[PDB]
Amino acid sequence: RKESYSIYVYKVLKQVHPDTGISSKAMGIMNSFVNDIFERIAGEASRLAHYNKRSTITSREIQTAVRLLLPGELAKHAVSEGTKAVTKYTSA
Amino acid sequence: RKESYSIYVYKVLKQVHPDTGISSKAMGIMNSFVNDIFERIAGEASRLAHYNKRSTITSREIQTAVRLLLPGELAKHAVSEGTKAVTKYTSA
Amino acid sequence: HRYRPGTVALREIRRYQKSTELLIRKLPFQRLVREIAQDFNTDLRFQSAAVGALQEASEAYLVGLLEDTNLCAIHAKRVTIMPKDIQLARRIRGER
Amino acid sequence: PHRYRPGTVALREIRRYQKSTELLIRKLPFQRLVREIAQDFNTDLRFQSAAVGALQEASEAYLVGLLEDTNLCAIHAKRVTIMPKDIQLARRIRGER
Amino acid sequence: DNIQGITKPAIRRLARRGGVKRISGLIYEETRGVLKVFLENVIRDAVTYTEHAKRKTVTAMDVVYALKRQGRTLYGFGG
Amino acid sequence: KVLRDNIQGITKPAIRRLARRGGVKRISGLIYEETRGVLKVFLENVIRDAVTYTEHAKRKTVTAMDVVYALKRQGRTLYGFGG
Amino acid sequence: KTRSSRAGLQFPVGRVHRLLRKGNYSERVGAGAPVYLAAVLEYLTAEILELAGNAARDNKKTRIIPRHLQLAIRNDEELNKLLGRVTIAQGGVLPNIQAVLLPK
Amino acid sequence: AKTRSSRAGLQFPVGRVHRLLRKGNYSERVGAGAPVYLAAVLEYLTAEILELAGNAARDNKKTRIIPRHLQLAIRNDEELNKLLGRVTIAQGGVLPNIQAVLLPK
DNA sequence: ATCAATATCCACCTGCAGATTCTACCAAAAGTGTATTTGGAAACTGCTCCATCAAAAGGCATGTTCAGCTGAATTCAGCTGAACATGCCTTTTGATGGAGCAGTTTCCAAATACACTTTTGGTAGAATCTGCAGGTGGATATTGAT
DNA sequence: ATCAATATCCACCTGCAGATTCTACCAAAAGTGTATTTGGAAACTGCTCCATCAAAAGGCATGTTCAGCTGAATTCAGCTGAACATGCCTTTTGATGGAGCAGTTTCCAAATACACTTTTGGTAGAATCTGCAGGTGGATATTGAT
């Protein structure tokens, strides 16, 4: 019931700013952000796959979707951390 | 190969304007129109089903999608012709 | 003592740009929302969060529109916003 | 020695080009431009004629719209002449900048 | 009736947050009209969402979906 | 041959015609360069996304459908070219 | 015998059904959905073709070209708002000149 | 018996993202690497926003991030501002900006 | 305002080459007929969540006065942009060749989707903590006036 | 520049409403083992695509003149902002009922999954039309001059 991104946002927050806290409304905004970006990326990926007659969405689609969706260096840092997470996941 | 709505558009054209013809570019634009509206409707319907946690798109989703997408009389005429088509289909 | 015109205007601008609270009163706004909604469907009932959401969206929209409006007034060599400005802003925006 | 007053031929041209639908930019320079930009994005890309055609239709449509918004901005400022200031205003209102 | 409920000082505050220094007297009615049209569109789509769910209570999510449709995405009430 | 400074290829008379279709009566001399700048930004964005689509498809020809998908992304939907 | 005929439609219901299933819109597709959708598409096609036919005839032409489509769309408010963010190739613009620019 | 998130070195849940992808209706098939990649990007963007917002927080002498700090963070940074150009942040307010022409002289 | 004289639509005809309409066969949707699931509607129901109601308080709107400064109107000169005729070249456009592509088939090793069985992270309320929202009071800036 | 009159910070404090941690169920990944696609890795065509060629055209760049328009300057009446005194209603807080939710079970009408049987839409030549591109000729607008 009522699945949320709260714990993960709080984890990341504690990673970057160890004694910064976050209000409820702010957390809600963060949740909205996550869901929105999720749906943009996934949507664009879905269209990408559909254009090329592919029935599967690989990490490649996510990447091209990021290149299309995000602006500039935000996009290349996102692509780099995505590739990094994927390669590290593939290992063991 | 390269399936098109050309034949159906031409049929409808001959119904409304029996001595009007249509150029290639005009027909192409018409095809773009049909596909565009198609994907707006189906998209909005998909979102509708997903919001209400339903895994199927019935004529109901299509109708609500039309009501959301179209403005004013366009919507009322579309809904009426849709409901009429569905009932006529169910009776035959 | 009396302040010159526009001084207090600037003061107010700084104040409300500094703050984030809702500017329209909630009860009249809720009454308005319920009127508009009733004419769409007759026995609708409303979540508090729904009215809150509507008020946030509305105030944001209006403020943005009003700064576009202000830009149009400044563009026309004027310091005062007028309905012509709002109409220009809304037609450039493509809202009509 | 006959000469039309300024703005007469302007209005005539406005009517002329508003009646017609043809592309106003010449095709070869536009193609050259598109291939340039694309090349500086990626060097081994090749272009369908229809791709450049699409780009030119989209671009001329866009520019024309922007220029009518610009014209409205000029009229609002009690002016008959469009200026870069007008384009900048139109583009910020549109949300392009 | 209640559309007039939104007051001149309230609209004035909205103008202040928007950076407006001087306000014509004719502005307020235009502002009320605009707000009215905006709410009409948004509430129409939200209400549509509520009806399709065969519900009789408009939820925050209905408003959010409507806003998303209108090209006015909202964070913090979703969603 | 090397492609260079083709943005100037778009001429003052062409921009003027575009203005006439837009209903513009009088044009400041500074307009033409500004117009070129705008067109350049627009084409850069659209062609950037088209090219991205071509890259994802592992193709070396930008197709009309690539352009159309790109335009649709930018909120500038186009009819008449296959999409 | 086809479903289009059963619904009294010109637009192919079957094709619409197929495209719904390939679209990824939902796990399942209702029997009534492709009928309803094809009906709405056929109607919108009809409306546009009527206004376009009118524009063509008004410019003394018997063959509909893109210009006629553009005239049709922009002169009708509802179609204009449905396709407000849409560009018609070779469609041109409506002839409109701001009053202040006319010579007097 | 350890989660995919840890395997990817992430705080964001890869499994949950995977599920949301396949039930999302985006495609018949979801690649094994796709939810990892996406979760990574989400975690990164949240990270950037949260750091800049944290900075906004410190700058206004607060230890708890509120919506205003998020708004300041988003609008003061160009890229985030353009990513969310058509997005409204509740209780965020606006950036303090006054046109020069309105200022005294 | 007429007269007259440029240039300009504005119309109708006409012959004709380029598209449009029309005709004739074939892979691939579309439709049929049976065998299985299944999703979501119907039918009860336990609960958060909304709608009134009441009442007291003080937080703001309303209404009024009155003056300062803004916007609208007029005048007018400088110069910038329109109009036009010259002359020169870059674009058009109508075919030609050779080529480097997508586009198609034919398969497979790798990757993903299922079908059950287990193993934890996630989440929901209680049980502790903790900034911060207000609340004053005094130092500094801002503003308007001599 | 100084003088008074507000307004704005900035510090410093403290209880509390709301954030953080803590405790136990359980939905939902994760792990195992089988069952299916598929997206490429090579091998191969048939086609648009790039790049010329070669005249001719018409469209462009340039330079000159001048009219009309843009921006600067002034005037002034009008209106909107600053401030205040009054009173109205919106804001707070708490309670009460119940209405409209979701949450659970149960079970068909509806949808999915295969294997054949037909029909159709698409593609490629065959067989007509329709704007179009000119061509005067008839009214129209624009501009200069009585």
Numbering used by the authors:
A (entry chain D), B (entry chain H): 33 to 124
C (entry chain E): 38 to 133
D (entry chain A): 37 to 133
E (entry chain F): 24 to 102
F (entry chain B): 20 to 102
G (entry chain G): 15 to 118
H (entry chain C): 14 to 118
What does the paper say about this structure?
As compared to H3.3, H3.5 has five amino acid differences at positions 29, 33, 78, 88, and 103. We previously purified the complexes corresponding to the bands remaining after the H3T nucleosome disruption, and confirmed that these bands were non-specific H2A-H2B-DNA complexes (asterisks). These results showed that the H3.5 nucleosome is more stable than the H3T nucleosome, but is clearly unstable as compared to the H3.1 and H3.3 nucleosomes. To understand the structural basis for the instability of the H3.5 nucleosome, we determined the crystal structure at 2.8 Å resolution. The overall structure was similar to that of the H3.3 nucleosome, as expected. Leu103, however, is located at the interface of H3.5 and H4, and may possibly exhibit reduced hydrophobic interactions compared with that of H3.3. In H3.3, the corresponding residue is Phe104, which fills the pocket created by the α1 and α2 helices of H4, and apparently forms hydrophobic interactions with the side chains of the H4 Ile34, Ile50, and Thr54 residues. In contrast, such close hydrophobic interactions are not observed around the Leu103 residue in the H3.5 nucleosome, because Leu has a smaller side chain than Phe. In contrast, the H3.5 L103F nucleosome remained intact at higher NaCl concentrations (lanes 9–12). The H3.5 tetrasome was disrupted at lower temperatures than the H3.3 tetrasome, indicating that H3.5 associates with DNA more weakly than H3.3. In the crystal structure of the H3.5 nucleosome, the H3.5 Leu103 residue forms fewer hydrophobic interactions with H4, as compared to the corresponding H3.3 Phe104 residue, and does not induce substantial structural distortion around the residue.
The nucleosome, which accommodates about 150 base pairs of DNA, is the fundamental structural unit of chromatin. The four core histones, H2A, H2B, H3, and H4, are the protein components of the nucleosome. Eight histone H3 variants, H3.1, H3.2, H3.3, H3T (H3.4), H3.5, H3.X, H3.Y, and CENP-A (CenH3), exist in humans. The H3.5 mRNA is highly expressed in the human testis.
